UniProtKB/Swiss-Prot annotation, chain B:
Record text on subunit structure and interactions: Homodimer.
EC identifiers of the protein: 2.3.1.179
Name this protein carries in UniProt: 3-oxoacyl-[acyl-carrier-protein] synthase 2
Lineage: Bacteria, Pseudomonadati, Pseudomonadota, Gammaproteobacteria, Vibrionales
GO cellular component: cytosol
Organism, as annotated: Vibrio cholerae serotype O1 (strain ATCC 39315 / El Tor Inaba N16961)
Length: 412, 413
């Protein structure tokens, strides 16, 4: 049985442009939510988002190359390079076919799609960019990173809305376990904070409209929550077969021990009232890892700050973990601080789950001023928590269409 | 003892038919599905034709209420998914729902509704954008809607890998069943990119044939006068099942999924490796997975999109992976000659075609192959279908933008 470990991590988030800076901000309870400044938001119901601060494309590639990539792709490349450099993995002629990429996005290149459609309508088909398709479609983070870094192993992109980053990591682990690859660069990226993105989620009434206090808008499980807060970013892990990593003396952050999947099969945007779908995914991941509820010290919850979603997930956690597990576990949502990073949520949060094991510290759910009644779990309100002898931690992503995933990591 | 994975249901909408059976018959007859675009004004477009699904009736497969919230690519995927499920006879109940999942994607998703949403935004502002904008357009919503409609609570995934989408979904669905995450999976892909922006975007890249005078002759894989691909729409879905589970409920079994391989060219954003090596890697991995050699593969359903650079490279890759192609023991053909390139659905429509080749011991042709390039050295099944004998294994390849490559191998029962 081939074991899979985490050897490299990289991140751009609303609270920092590295893993280390982001983690420090999260433990400090810092929000990354700000007013949108790049377009006129007057007619929009929501005027704020978790934005990546001070991204310079020219640092990573030429302006000529960047003209060929929507920002979501630029972000994913930046995180991917970070994670690769963090891992120290050397790619050469001999191993290139054993190192691949599993990276996606939930929506892809909305800004360049908008720009292409405008060109079409204004000046006709001949004025659409020759790079329209490669610049916008969701598999092109994997595509471009593979090309840039010589990675010839399996090349995939899962695109499962909010679950995207989590699925990519899980399947990357599966492919290494199976023998298709010895290492994988995996995760997700998103930059949906565009006019059409904000308008589309707004029209669904899915976003908080707390425009007066953007940093208090994201408040998972709080009685006054009123929808999620959209954020942009990228989270990438380098995953590696254990013996390969052990054999080269690798610094190893954690082991990927469980991956579970399910579908709510309930509703397009609302989760199962009973939380059973999320429970299935958690239960499958626990079976995969061969652990019981009591062994899971921390769950980095999906917790997006929606009325229906937040409650259902707690019911599902309680089912999956059982009585004894539920008594001792900590649960928190870092979307309280970052917002909901969509295609990057699941991978950013997987990195956070790993760091909780590495540092034996659990970040808070901020803004949890007045929790709903009857939750019956410790939601780590307001401030970080030191833990002791935490050996396993779990992260959940539950996306639109009922697509659910859970990963379990083991301390290393 | 690996958990064996078999095909127990198939469904399809294509430019040449709205069922597997009608499509397969048209393909064996060499019939083209390429027609002029009538649904928008194509005057200013360099390419004015496409492989269109004819007479699609959404009400055949779902309610109008369901369909309201869906771009056509989703409607097409749901229609094929329902077809395949009904073809499999798989009964979903409270006891098995958590063991039956979905792996379906698209390469581009809901371009039409994205266009419509952007138009609304620009004309009348954000408040005029549809409340269903996001669920109607994003690529994981075929999986999402089918799961919801049919009570499928097993793993729910959507791989989106451009041209390789349909194939990757089927392969990973097989992997997940093999691994134990599910006992059955509904898998494949769908696309409806024949929209103003879709046609404009591929046109601007000079990726499409511009043979507007003779749309049915435009798609001509490996022919000297090929001038880019012909875009088509559709959906292809398979129900996959664990072999013992399939036997135990009395499933119809079409074929066995025995090999799945993947690689990346790592060469260029849109051009394939000149040497075809990336495709070869994927083929080779699939052959190792299946434990077969070149001699055992009777047929390769090629990616063969009718592009100058792509078609030649793939043959070099096939010859590397499979010795016996070059000695004409392995037949190779591109059904994109008839359907066009169905993008996110290409890989799964073609998987179905590869399965039917094993079921009926017949291989469909590459039409329009009037003047092949020199030095190919393989049997490209030009013009007319081929009866075969004792074909036990057949392979299908998809090689997409960004250099993403996949290969599947099926075994006859």
């Amino acid at each position: 049985k081939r074991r899979v470990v985490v050897t490299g991590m990289g991140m751009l988030s609303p609270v920092g442009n590295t893993v280390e800076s982001s983690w420090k901000a999260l433990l400090a309870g810092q929000s990354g939510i700000v007013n949108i400044e790049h377009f006129d938001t007057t007619n929009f119901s929501t005027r704020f988002a978790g934005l990546v601060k001070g991204f310079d494309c020219e640092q990573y590639m030429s302006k000529k190359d960047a003209r060929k990539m929507d920002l979501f792709i630029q972000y994913g490349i930046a995180a991917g390079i970070q994670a690769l450099e963090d891992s120290g993995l050397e790619v050469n002629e001999e191993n290139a076919a054993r190192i691949g990429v599993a990276i996606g996005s939930g929506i892809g290149g909305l800004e360049l799609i908008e720009t292409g459609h405008q060109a079409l309508i204004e000046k006709g088909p001949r004025k659409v960019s020759p790079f329209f398709v490669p610049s916008t479609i969701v598999n092109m983070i994997a595509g471009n990173l593979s090309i840039m870094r010589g990675l010839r192993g399996p090349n995939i992109a899962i695109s499962t809305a909010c679950t995207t980053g989590l699925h990519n990591i899980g399947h990357a682990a599966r492919m290494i376990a199976y023998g298709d690859a010895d290492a994988m660069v995996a995760g997700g990226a998103e930059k949906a904070s565009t006019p059409l993105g904000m308008a589309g989620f707004g029209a669904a009434k899915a976003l908080s409209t707390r425009n007066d206090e953007p940093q208090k808008a994201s408040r998972p499980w709080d009685k006054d929550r009123d929808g999620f807060v959209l954020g942009d970013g990228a989270g990438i892990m380098v995953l590696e077969e254990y013996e390969h990593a052990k054999a080269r003396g690798a610094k190893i952050y954690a082991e990927v021990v469980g991956f579970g999947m399910s579908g709510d099969a309930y509703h397009m945007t609302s989760p199962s009232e009973d939380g059973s779908g999320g429970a299935l995914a958690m239960e499958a991941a626990m079976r995969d890892a061969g652990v019981t509820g009591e062994q899971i010290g921390y769950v980095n919850a999906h917790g997006t700050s929606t009325p229906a979603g937040d409650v259902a997930e707690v019911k599902g956690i309680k089912r999956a973990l059982g009585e004894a597990g539920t008594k001792q576990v900590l649960v928190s949502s870092t979307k309280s601080m970052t917002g909901h990073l969509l295609g990057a949520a699941g991978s950013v949060e997987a990195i956070i789950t790993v760091m909780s094991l590495v540092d034996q510290m659990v970040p808070p759910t901020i803004n949890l001023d007045n929790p709903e009644e009857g939750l019956g779990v410790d939601l780590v309100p307001h401030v970080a928590r030191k833990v002791e002898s935490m050996e396993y931690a779990m992260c959940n992503s539950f996306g639109f269409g009922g697509t659910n995933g859970s990963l379990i990591f083991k301390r290393m």
